[PDB]
Amino acid sequence: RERAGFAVRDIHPSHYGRICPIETPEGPNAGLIGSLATHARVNDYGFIETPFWRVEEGRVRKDLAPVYMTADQEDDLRVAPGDVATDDAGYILGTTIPVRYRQDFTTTTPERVDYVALSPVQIISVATSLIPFLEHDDANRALMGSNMQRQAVPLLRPERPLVGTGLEPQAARDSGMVITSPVDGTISYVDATHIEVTADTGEKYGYALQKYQRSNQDTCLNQRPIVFEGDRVQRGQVIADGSATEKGELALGQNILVAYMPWEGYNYEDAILISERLVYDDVYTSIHIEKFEIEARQTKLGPEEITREIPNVGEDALRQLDENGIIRVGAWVESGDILVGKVTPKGESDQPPEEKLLRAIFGEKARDVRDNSLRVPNGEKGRVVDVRLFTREQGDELPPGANMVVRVYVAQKRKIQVGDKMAGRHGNKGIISRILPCEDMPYLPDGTPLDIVLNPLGVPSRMNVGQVFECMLGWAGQLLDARFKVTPFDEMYGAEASRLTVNAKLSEAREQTGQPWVFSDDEPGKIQVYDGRTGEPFDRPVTVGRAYMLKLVHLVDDKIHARSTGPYSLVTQQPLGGKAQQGGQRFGEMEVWALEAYGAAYILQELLTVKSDDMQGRNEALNAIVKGKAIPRPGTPESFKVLMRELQSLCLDIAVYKASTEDYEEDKEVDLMADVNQRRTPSRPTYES
Amino acid sequence: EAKSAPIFRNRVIDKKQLKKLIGWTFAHYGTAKTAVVADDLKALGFRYATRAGVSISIDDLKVPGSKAELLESAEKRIQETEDRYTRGEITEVERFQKVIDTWANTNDELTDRVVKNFRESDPLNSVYMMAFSGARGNISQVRQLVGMRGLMANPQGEIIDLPIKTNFREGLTVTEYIISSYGARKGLVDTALRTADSGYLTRRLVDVSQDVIIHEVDCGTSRGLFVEAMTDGDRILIPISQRLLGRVTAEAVLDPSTDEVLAEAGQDINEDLANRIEKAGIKKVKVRSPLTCEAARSVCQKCYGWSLAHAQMVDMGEAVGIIAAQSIGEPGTQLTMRTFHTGGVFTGETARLLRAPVAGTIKLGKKARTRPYRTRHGEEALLAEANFDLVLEGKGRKETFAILQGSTIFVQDGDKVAAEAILAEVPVSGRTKRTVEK
Amino acid sequence: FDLDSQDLLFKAESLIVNSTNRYHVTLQIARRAKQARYEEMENLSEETGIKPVLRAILEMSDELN
């Protein structure tokens, strides 16, 4: 990364059809990691090939076994792109065809052409190929949409888009959760965990299905049947599907009603306002599964034991355990609950030995153990769905120095709430800021309230106008039950292909449904909308449609953190860093510059000494606050003393001196590493008495 | 806090008027009334933004109907240039320069037509209303939405000669998308790789001047600096009233008309005094500067002047070096990370053309000294050696133009120049950019 | 309560305006607040429903009259 130049992060003319020019990381390693194109393949030497069709005198031979070529093979031929239009899949129309010759864009007559690309979307990758109307967007927004399509969460009941692109079934099939019938027979047995297929000949095939398993990112993997008993199936028909697929197709989000207008300041800067129907109808509800582990080692002092008798704990903390001391399957647990009870026989020496020796001589053996059992962390709850126990004498390969391992699985259901991130496929993202009762939302002339309101101010600034096409097509699709599919770069058949297609579909829907308010001729995409609070119509009609939206993995439940006092570092004696270990926030040098520019000196001094590493001032401040008195003045931080010792270790004579007030007496060295006040200095602040 | 009544503004209110009102309120009432005024204005705007029902539609993006003829003329000119290069009369550099200039001029004319059509046809269009009211947008994005994208730039900052002749409402082709990928990559690389230079610069700036603190009240100095306006030829880029606000005079200021004195020696300048000074002539003013302070520390209170955040003299004990460093270093770092907001388009900056309004004949002058010259487009013209005057006489109208030294002239004495014909050109300057190897 | 934060904002602005240095008046307010808190803590109970800094601001603004 450090020794990489700058020509390696650029796009070369030889990348076309072999490496996607859009999908790339957006960090320090941008331009160093790429994605293979959709049609590319690698030969037996290690070079990348791409296919083409040959032309003869001006006719494209679309039935002649396409030719795969390498980057250096096509340098001396005139190659045309995939958007060249032909009469009847035969002769090339027009009189000036753009071609690539010797790594240069040129133009030539439609008789010197040698090869033509197979598809207009041969240049992009799989993720970028799922965005409809992509030629009306910006490239950066396409990259953002491709990136954000991979962060969606599988939902409880997924839905496939009304407006697609034609690549969803293959993407769903080529990843390994869809089960398909291999023969042409009937269905003999269906059950939530087993499917049997009997062919016409008489042999049988059986399949078992996954049920509520865990992924690498604590998501859910689940399979469900599609068919019924006695149904007649064919070859290649889908009989079961995964967690994030509809009946054979990829499904990541949902189709919801959208209007483009501002509300009372709740759409200010890319914020989102939604309805309450999305909560109680279980839309955007997901399932998450977590795993907890515990082990029983053997220390030099004595082996540890997994048991139920936990010293110094109430009876209400052992209701759900059983015999051995392991939680039962099907219990509801909150923070602080005991999952597995472990006790350690340890002989700590921190008490006067007289009582211990007297008890040892007399006898009356009792509990000399410690409690460090497994408890659920703060901010977690759910159901226990699986407990697994591994021990010796069972043919198990445990880690050396261990005698028992226990694993527990906990499942949770999550709904959408304020602070969650939502996004679409065209690079539009936002955070939910308000949830409204359905009687306060705007409603249609039909009387139907809306589902989500988006600010129009962000559409022309971000330059992603494909979402309007998508919404206006989805409106007609819902009104017609049609589920269209469109291929990008559709202007090779005309001049205003997308607009004319959308207008024709909307007019056909208006004629079929019989409602004249669904389409207008003066304002093609706009409808009248009323106010649910007062009943008065708005001044101008607004844009209404159906949008395909997704929910991302950035949830506010995993982002809120606070600290008062916790652990400190061993060397510098400063607060630890990290959410997972009760860490503090860093106050960098730019913030110090800002505080110096403001002129607040006491705030800065209190931040630098009392709150970070003045080992004696911390407890004084805490106890002064508790007792309601003033906070005493600080001393010297520990990091300066550490630096002085480190500098002295390099054979440098560095010390602090006190100026001589009067007389000839020389200046006197000051001992910084000495105690001034006869008071205690513990490692952590504590409440005395 | 009182005694000033607001004026009745009977006009349309855009962002500039709101900023003027906020400044007036702060200057006349204080810092406590301004917050409540801003809160009230915010509430009113929020309330009346949703009553209107502003939305966006596909048919709201209007494209002018005269684009095709403009494009056809551009292709004719480009084909002429390419034929000339093929014959063997110019080199490759001159062809590249000519095509670049032609496409830039075509884009400028197209966006002018777009703005005129949008203003004349419907002033209540949502795109027009929320772009030209100062809300969120700017001209360079509406240009790409309803005009044409134009020329791109690759990550190294160089221009690609193949333009994009479509816009987003019409849809791009495969080649144009491939070309746009270069601007996308340029923005991506610029955002995270070039931001280290600005941070290094601001760290160095903070380190060099972290000990400049106001410690003295007055040093007793008569030295100072001369301040005037910032102009480019005959156009004023920065007026003198904006530069004099908050400074202390080093000498008395006299009206060039009468014996009246506008200010004394050792007087700070507020807005009204600066306006009075500018309105009554006066081209240079001598002021106290930190460059010439005689204090035996860093700076004194009298040689610094106002504090811009509070609109009054500085307080004793202010750390002004930190403020200076983080005022200089912030805008560059912020602007480096906003490059991707416009794709990768090339920001044009062309020469200044002098055009003949009406037909006639050229008279020239008597001090006109010229030499044969070859322009950057591969043309033969005349380069001037001293300032003179060009006289264009017509049927009943006679006009004079002033030609400076260094500009090129495409005409001679006695020619019959038609209407709307180019007469002279002032080329762009090479300053404000770094010089590299060839 | 009858005392809103807006009145405190106006009082603080008035205190800042009628002085030559903002840091000096900030230090004076801090000293007065500390003295008032110490006086409260050792005697009687007082109208405890107001923070010492707000009390110091109120008395200092009332002394301007």
Binding site: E596, G599, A600, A601, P637, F640 | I213, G317, A319 | -
Partner: peptide, 16 residues
């Protein structure tokens, strides 16, 4: 330098 050793900076309210 007063930041490293933990003293009042000589600017602002810590001027004197």
């Amino acid at each position: 330098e007063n930041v490293i050793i933990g003293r009042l900076i000589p600017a602002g309210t810590g001027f004197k």
